[PDB]
Amino acid sequence: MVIATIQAEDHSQQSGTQQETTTDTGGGKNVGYIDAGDWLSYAGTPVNIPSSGSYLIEYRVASQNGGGSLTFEEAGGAPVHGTIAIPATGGWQTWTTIQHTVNLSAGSHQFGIKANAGGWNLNWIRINKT
């Protein structure tokens, strides 16, 4: 089942981005103005991983032109858990959920996201058991 849902805007620190209203299901806000080098820290909300192993990480994303990518990691940069390409979705508020698997150690994690290439918006992230 679901370990955590983290709204992207609920970061404890960030660099290079700005919040904006989203018209995705549920409304609220998304993170926008994402470019290479920009990042989001969720260190203020540690997430508990119950056992070491494979977890599915989902990202709710929108992208006009595609070309984006991110790195999912611990806040601060290391260890890195995984990377994912962000596809074109049709528009800045046309939303889809993408996913990948990563290995995570058991215990408390402070997650972060680094943008390797921009061109996308982020509504929320979800961590799931496999």
For residue 63, what is the DSSP state? -
How many other CB atoms sit within 10 Å of the CB of residue 6? 17
User: With binding defined as CB under 5 A, does residue 121 bind Ca ion?
Assistant: no
User: With binding defined as CB under 5 A, does residue 19 bind Ca ion?
Assistant: no
User: With binding defined as CB under 5 A, does residue 35 bind Ca ion?
Assistant: yes
User: With binding defined as CB under 5 A, does residue 7 bind Ca ion?
Assistant: yes
8 Å CB contact between 106 and 57? no
Least distance in angstroms from the C-beta of 65 to Ca ion: 15
- Helix then strand then coil, in percent of the chain rounded to 5, is 0, 60, 40
Least distance in angstroms from the C-beta of 82 to Ca ion: 21
Least distance in angstroms from the C-beta of 74 to Ca ion: 22
> Nearest CA to 11 among 127, 123, 129?
123
114 is in an annotated binding site: no
Rounded to whole angstroms, how far apart are CA atoms 5 and 3? Answer: 7
Question: Which single residue is written with the structure tokens 């046309």?
Answer: 94
User: With binding defined as CB under 5 A, does residue 115 bind Ca ion?
Assistant: no
18 is in an annotated binding site: no
Pick out the residues of the known binding site for Ca(2+): 7, 9, 16, 29, 33, 35, 38, 123
Positions that interact with Ca ion (CB under 5 A)? 7, 16, 28, 33, 35, 38, 123-124
